[PDB]
């Protein structure tokens, strides 16, 4: 599963970390897919039954096949006993066995000499296409995501 | 190794329908997204549909919007393409190619690392 | 869809000697720093393969004689020292809006 710049997130947004992209859901929705975000269900039981309870996780509330339930949210399997720290785990498609690595936040890079975790100061350019002339690549909250530049109601640029 | 084999081609009218199929092996089908590829005889490729391995990103050319839906079902490893309303310059040779995205760090790129040996398309009186 | 154009057509070349394809867009493919042109070599009975991303970097496991250059509108493809299994069609590919191909030129032997 592999987001690239020209994914259109349903009801959400792309991101970008130190080596990846995502799709991040709007107000407090849930992915469904690696590009789509759909409502919740507070409680699973018979009325929600196959419903979205959690990102990646339907009522049976159990993860989809290939995650697991770790602080009550789903995590990749591969990425279970994996800890970063100023930043996230995430896999690649590039190894035949699914190996979990990191990804930094915004300014951090894999350290090599600290066990491949988050520490390393280093830059990364944005790759995000943010066309729209109201709308420019910042960088927020340790992420990157194209914003408003000059004036936006309240949610429009324009 | 990575294997594309398209099927579903043949002869058809103007104004026909004509429905390709493409069934993925050697990878998992379900984590790639897929493009359609055509070359007309004495022609350059043209690029047809993109779509994501979610089905939630789809783009067509200009010169197939309308007339060709793009869909997949990676329960079956499979790719499809329908095409109605087809003109005479849609004779082609249709390929369903693999889109590998490499996140490198000199920039995020698309390869087409993968390409059925296609089936040929002629529509014609 | 945005258009993309090469020259030449065809392009003779004599093996030892260099090349230039031109490859130019309907518009501009530059934002952000970045050049959304991406050329391909597609050898006789092969399949198209990618050379080069993002207007000048190598994929991985392309010769160092292949180069790619320009910004916004003009790109160009150079090949320093013209080796003979370089014969073939190279195309330009825009990625700015998903996706479109130049009309391709073939690289011939020079007699």
């Known amino acids: 599963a592999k987001v690239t710049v020209d994914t259109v997130c349903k009801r959400g947004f792309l991101i970008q970390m130190s080596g990846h992209l995502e799709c991040k859901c709007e107000n407090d929705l849930v992915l469904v897919n690696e590009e789509t975000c759909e409502e919740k269900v507070l409680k699973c039981d018979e009325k929600t039954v196959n419903k979205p309870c959690g990102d990646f996780s339907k009522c049976i509330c159990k993860c989809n096949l290939g995650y697991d339930m770790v602080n009550n949210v789903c995590i990749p399997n591969e990425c279970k006993q994996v800890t970063c720290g100023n930043g996230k785990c995430i896999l690649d498609t590039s190894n035949p066995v699914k190996t979990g690595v990191c990804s930094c936040n915004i300014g951090k890079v894999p350290n090599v000499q600290d066990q491949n975790k988050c520490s390393k100061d280093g830059e990364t350019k944005c790759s995000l296409k943010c066309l729209k002339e109201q709308e420019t690549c910042k960088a927020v909250d340790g992420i990157y995501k194209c914003d408003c530049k000059d004036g936006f109601i309240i949610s429009i640029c324009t | 190794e990575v294997q594309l084999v398209e099927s579903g081609g043949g002869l058809v009218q103007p104004g026909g329908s004509l429905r390709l199929s493409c069934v993925a092996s050697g990878f998992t089908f379900s984590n790639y997204n897929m493009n359609w590829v055509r070359q007309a005889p004495g022609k350059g490729l043209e690029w047809l549909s993109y779509i994501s391995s979610s089905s939630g990103t789809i783009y067509y050319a200009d010169s197939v919007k309308g007339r060709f839906t793009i869909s997949r079902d990676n329960a079956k490893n499979s790719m499809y393409l329908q095409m109605n309303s087809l003109r005479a310059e849609d004779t082609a040779v249709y390929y369903c190619?693999?889109?590998?995205?490499?996140?490198?760090?000199?920039?995020?790129?698309?390869?087409?690392?993968?390409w059925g040996q296609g089936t040929l398309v002629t529509v014609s009186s | 869809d945005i258009v993309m154009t090469q020259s030449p057509l065809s392009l003779p070349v004599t093996p030892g000697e260099p090349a230039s394809i031109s490859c130019r867009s309907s518009?501009?493919?530059?934002?952000?720093?970045?050049?959304?042109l991406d050329w391909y070599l597609q050898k006789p009975g092969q399949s198209p393969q990618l050379l080069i991303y993002?207007?000048?970097n190598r994929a991985s496991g392309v010769p160092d004689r292949f180069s790619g250059s320009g910004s916004g509108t003009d790109f160009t493809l150079k090949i320093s020292r013209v080796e003979a299994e370089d014969v073939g069609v190279y195309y330009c590919m825009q990625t700015l809006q998903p996706f479109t191909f130049g009309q391709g030129t073939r690289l011939e032997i020079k007699r």
């Open positions: 993002l207007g000048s």
């Open positions: 518009q501009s493919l530059l934002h952000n720093g970045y050049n959304y």
């Open positions: 190619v693999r889109v590998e995205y490499y996140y490198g760090s000199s920039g995020y790129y698309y390869d087409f690392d993968s």
